[PDB]
Amino acid sequence: KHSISDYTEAEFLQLVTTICNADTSSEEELVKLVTHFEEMTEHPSGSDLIYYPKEGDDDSPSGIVNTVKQWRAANGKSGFKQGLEHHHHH
Protein backbone atom coordinates (compact mmCIF):
# COMPACT_ATOMS: atom_id res chain seq x y z
CA LYS A 1 0.00 0.00 0.00
CA HIS A 2 2.34 2.86 1.01
CA SER A 3 5.74 1.72 -0.26
CA ILE A 4 7.27 -1.47 -1.61
CA SER A 5 8.41 -2.63 1.81
CA ASP A 6 4.69 -3.00 2.60
CA TYR A 7 4.61 -5.84 0.00
CA THR A 8 5.95 -9.32 0.43
CA GLU A 9 7.56 -10.66 -2.77
CA ALA A 10 4.53 -12.94 -3.32
CA GLU A 11 2.02 -10.03 -2.99
CA PHE A 12 4.20 -8.03 -5.42
CA LEU A 13 4.18 -10.99 -7.88
CA GLN A 14 0.37 -11.06 -7.64
CA LEU A 15 0.29 -7.28 -8.40
CA VAL A 16 2.71 -7.60 -11.41
CA THR A 17 0.83 -10.62 -12.76
CA THR A 18 -2.43 -8.65 -12.46
CA ILE A 19 -0.90 -5.90 -14.59
CA CYS A 20 0.73 -8.20 -17.15
CA ASN A 21 -2.55 -10.08 -17.75
CA ALA A 22 -4.61 -6.82 -17.74
CA ASP A 23 -6.77 -8.38 -14.96
CA THR A 24 -8.88 -5.25 -14.45
CA SER A 25 -12.45 -4.21 -15.19
CA SER A 26 -11.42 -1.02 -17.02
CA GLU A 27 -8.51 0.62 -18.68
CA GLU A 28 -8.66 3.36 -15.94
CA GLU A 29 -8.03 0.68 -13.26
CA LEU A 30 -5.09 -0.83 -15.22
CA VAL A 31 -3.53 2.60 -15.70
CA LYS A 32 -3.92 3.25 -11.95
CA LEU A 33 -2.21 -0.06 -11.05
CA VAL A 34 0.64 0.68 -13.46
CA THR A 35 1.13 4.09 -11.79
CA HIS A 36 1.08 2.45 -8.37
CA PHE A 37 3.67 -0.09 -9.59
CA GLU A 38 5.94 2.79 -10.73
CA GLU A 39 5.55 4.49 -7.32
CA MET A 40 6.41 1.26 -5.49
CA THR A 41 9.49 0.37 -7.52
CA GLU A 42 10.86 3.91 -7.71
CA HIS A 43 12.60 2.71 -10.89
CA PRO A 44 13.46 5.50 -13.43
CA SER A 45 12.04 3.32 -16.30
CA GLY A 46 8.57 3.31 -14.75
CA SER A 47 6.05 1.35 -16.82
CA ASP A 48 8.76 0.41 -19.34
CA LEU A 49 9.74 -2.43 -16.95
CA ILE A 50 6.46 -4.04 -17.93
CA TYR A 51 5.77 -2.93 -21.50
CA TYR A 52 9.14 -2.08 -23.03
CA PRO A 53 11.72 -4.32 -21.35
CA LYS A 54 15.42 -3.71 -22.13
CA GLU A 55 16.69 -6.21 -24.72
CA GLY A 56 17.58 -9.42 -22.81
CA ASP A 57 15.33 -8.71 -19.84
CA ASP A 58 12.82 -11.26 -18.68
CA ASP A 59 9.33 -9.68 -19.09
CA SER A 60 7.40 -12.52 -17.41
CA PRO A 61 5.76 -11.46 -14.11
CA SER A 62 8.56 -13.24 -12.20
CA GLY A 63 11.12 -11.66 -14.50
CA ILE A 64 9.86 -8.18 -13.65
CA VAL A 65 9.70 -8.83 -9.89
CA ASN A 66 13.31 -9.98 -10.09
CA THR A 67 14.45 -6.92 -12.03
CA VAL A 68 12.84 -4.68 -9.43
CA LYS A 69 14.21 -6.64 -6.47
CA GLN A 70 17.72 -6.56 -7.87
CA TRP A 71 17.66 -2.95 -8.95
CA ARG A 72 16.49 -1.93 -5.51
CA ALA A 73 19.24 -4.09 -3.86
CA ALA A 74 21.91 -2.50 -6.03
CA ASN A 75 20.76 1.07 -5.47
CA GLY A 76 20.65 0.66 -1.71
CA LYS A 77 16.87 0.85 -1.41
CA SER A 78 14.55 -1.14 0.82
CA GLY A 79 13.16 -4.50 -0.24
CA PHE A 80 10.18 -6.77 0.25
CA LYS A 81 8.54 -7.54 3.57
CA GLN A 82 9.36 -11.11 4.52
CA GLY A 83 6.45 -13.50 3.91
CA LEU A 84 5.03 -15.80 6.61
CA GLU A 85 4.72 -19.22 4.97
CA HIS A 86 1.69 -21.18 6.06
CA HIS A 87 2.72 -24.63 7.31
CA HIS A 88 0.05 -27.40 7.21
CA HIS A 89 1.90 -29.58 9.77
CA HIS A 90 4.29 -29.51 12.72
Binding site: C20, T24, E27, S45, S47, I50, Y51, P53
Partner: protein
Protein backbone atom coordinates in the same frame (compact mmCIF):
# COMPACT_ATOMS: atom_id res chain seq x y z
CA UNK B 1 -21.97 16.27 -27.34
CA UNK B 2 -21.83 14.55 -30.70
CA UNK B 3 -18.96 12.18 -29.82
CA UNK B 4 -21.25 10.75 -27.13
CA UNK B 5 -23.96 9.83 -29.60
CA UNK B 6 -24.19 6.80 -31.89
CA UNK B 7 -22.87 6.92 -35.43
CA UNK B 8 -21.46 4.75 -38.23
CA UNK B 9 -17.77 4.24 -38.99
CA UNK B 10 -16.71 5.16 -42.56
CA UNK B 11 -13.40 5.60 -44.32
CA UNK B 12 -10.54 3.72 -45.85
CA UNK B 13 -7.72 4.08 -43.34
CA UNK B 14 -4.16 3.54 -44.72
CA UNK B 15 -1.69 0.67 -45.27
CA UNK B 16 0.72 0.66 -42.38
CA UNK B 17 3.40 -1.75 -41.53
CA UNK B 18 5.51 -3.18 -38.83
CA UNK B 19 6.22 -0.38 -36.42
CA UNK B 20 3.01 1.53 -37.21
CA UNK B 21 2.76 2.65 -33.58
CA UNK B 22 6.29 4.13 -33.75
CA UNK B 23 4.79 6.77 -36.15
CA UNK B 24 2.30 7.71 -33.47
CA UNK B 25 5.01 9.90 -31.84
CA UNK B 26 5.68 11.89 -35.07
CA UNK B 27 3.92 14.09 -37.59
CA UNK B 28 0.13 14.05 -37.30
CA UNK B 29 0.30 10.60 -35.60
CA UNK B 30 -0.52 7.27 -37.29
CA UNK B 31 -3.65 6.71 -39.40
CA UNK B 32 -6.21 4.02 -38.65
CA UNK B 33 -4.77 0.92 -40.47
CA UNK B 34 -6.69 0.00 -43.58
CA UNK B 35 -7.43 -3.49 -42.27
CA UNK B 36 -8.99 -2.08 -39.09
CA UNK B 37 -11.08 0.37 -41.06
CA UNK B 38 -12.11 -2.65 -43.22
CA UNK B 39 -13.36 -4.46 -40.12
CA UNK B 40 -15.20 -1.46 -38.58
CA UNK B 41 -16.59 0.19 -41.74
CA UNK B 42 -20.39 0.49 -41.82
CA UNK B 43 -20.69 -0.67 -38.24
CA UNK B 44 -22.60 1.37 -35.76
CA UNK B 45 -21.03 2.44 -32.49
CA UNK B 46 -22.66 3.91 -29.41
CA UNK B 47 -20.08 6.65 -28.75
CA UNK B 48 -16.54 7.47 -29.85
CA UNK B 49 -15.25 5.59 -26.80
CA UNK B 50 -17.14 2.48 -27.97
CA UNK B 51 -15.41 2.91 -31.37
CA UNK B 52 -12.07 3.43 -29.65
CA UNK B 53 -12.44 0.07 -27.76
CA UNK B 54 -13.28 -1.76 -31.03
CA UNK B 55 -10.16 -0.29 -32.66
CA UNK B 56 -7.85 -1.79 -30.02
CA UNK B 57 -9.68 -5.10 -30.02
CA UNK B 58 -9.39 -5.30 -33.81
CA UNK B 59 -5.71 -4.41 -33.39
CA UNK B 60 -5.41 -7.38 -31.00
CA UNK B 61 -6.90 -9.67 -33.69
CA UNK B 62 -4.51 -8.55 -36.44
CA UNK B 63 -1.27 -10.56 -36.33
CA UNK B 64 0.81 -7.97 -38.19
CA UNK B 65 -0.51 -4.95 -36.36
CA UNK B 66 -0.17 -6.51 -32.86
CA UNK B 67 3.10 -8.37 -33.32
CA UNK B 68 5.25 -5.40 -32.13
CA UNK B 69 3.27 -5.21 -28.87
CA UNK B 70 4.85 -7.09 -25.94
CA UNK B 71 2.78 -9.81 -24.17
CA UNK B 72 1.53 -7.38 -21.49
CA UNK B 73 0.42 -4.83 -24.07
CA UNK B 74 -1.25 -7.57 -26.08
CA UNK B 75 -3.26 -8.55 -22.98
CA UNK B 76 -4.35 -4.89 -22.70
CA UNK B 77 -5.53 -4.45 -26.32
CA UNK B 78 -7.36 -7.81 -26.21
CA UNK B 79 -9.65 -6.24 -23.56
CA UNK B 80 -10.18 -3.16 -25.81
CA UNK B 81 -7.81 -1.03 -23.69
CA UNK B 82 -5.27 1.31 -25.35
CA UNK B 83 -1.71 -0.03 -25.28
CA UNK B 84 0.87 1.75 -23.02
CA UNK B 85 3.39 3.91 -24.88
CA UNK B 86 7.10 4.10 -23.90
CA UNK B 87 7.50 6.04 -20.71
CA UNK B 88 9.21 8.95 -22.48
CA UNK B 89 6.11 9.45 -24.66
CA UNK B 90 3.67 9.63 -21.74
CA UNK B 91 2.44 12.91 -20.20
CA UNK B 92 1.54 12.77 -16.48
CA UNK B 93 -1.35 10.35 -16.13
CA UNK B 94 -1.75 9.93 -19.92
CA UNK B 95 0.15 6.68 -20.41
CA UNK B 96 -1.57 5.11 -23.43
CA UNK B 97 -1.90 5.74 -27.16
CA UNK B 98 -4.66 8.24 -27.90
CA UNK B 99 -7.25 8.55 -30.70
CA UNK B 100 -7.89 12.12 -31.82
CA UNK B 101 -9.55 13.87 -34.73
CA UNK B 102 -7.64 15.58 -37.42
CA UNK B 103 -10.16 18.23 -38.48
CA UNK B 104 -11.95 19.21 -35.20
CA UNK B 105 -15.64 18.30 -34.75
CA UNK B 106 -16.54 21.99 -34.37
CA UNK B 107 -15.22 22.70 -37.91
CA UNK B 108 -17.13 19.83 -39.49
CA UNK B 109 -14.69 16.91 -38.81
CA UNK B 110 -16.83 13.74 -38.46
CA UNK B 111 -16.75 11.69 -35.27
CA UNK B 112 -16.57 8.23 -36.89
CA UNK B 113 -14.81 9.08 -40.16
CA UNK B 114 -11.78 6.83 -39.87
CA UNK B 115 -9.80 9.03 -42.28
CA UNK B 116 -10.27 11.88 -39.79
CA UNK B 117 -8.88 9.96 -36.83
CA UNK B 118 -5.22 9.69 -35.93
CA UNK B 119 -3.33 7.67 -33.29
CA UNK B 120 -0.87 9.74 -31.15
CA UNK B 121 1.34 9.34 -28.11
CA UNK B 122 0.30 11.75 -25.32
CA UNK B 123 3.60 13.62 -25.96
CA UNK B 124 2.90 14.17 -29.65
CA UNK B 125 -0.66 15.21 -28.98
CA UNK B 126 0.36 17.82 -26.40
CA UNK B 127 2.88 19.24 -28.87
CA UNK B 128 0.24 19.52 -31.56
CA UNK B 129 -2.21 20.95 -29.02
CA UNK B 130 0.23 23.60 -27.78
CA UNK B 131 0.96 24.86 -31.29
CA UNK B 132 -2.72 25.63 -32.11
Amino acid sequence: SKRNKPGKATGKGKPVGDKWLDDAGKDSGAPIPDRIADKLRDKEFKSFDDFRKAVWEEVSKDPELSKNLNPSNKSSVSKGYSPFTPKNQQVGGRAVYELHHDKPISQGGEVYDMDNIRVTTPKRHIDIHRGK
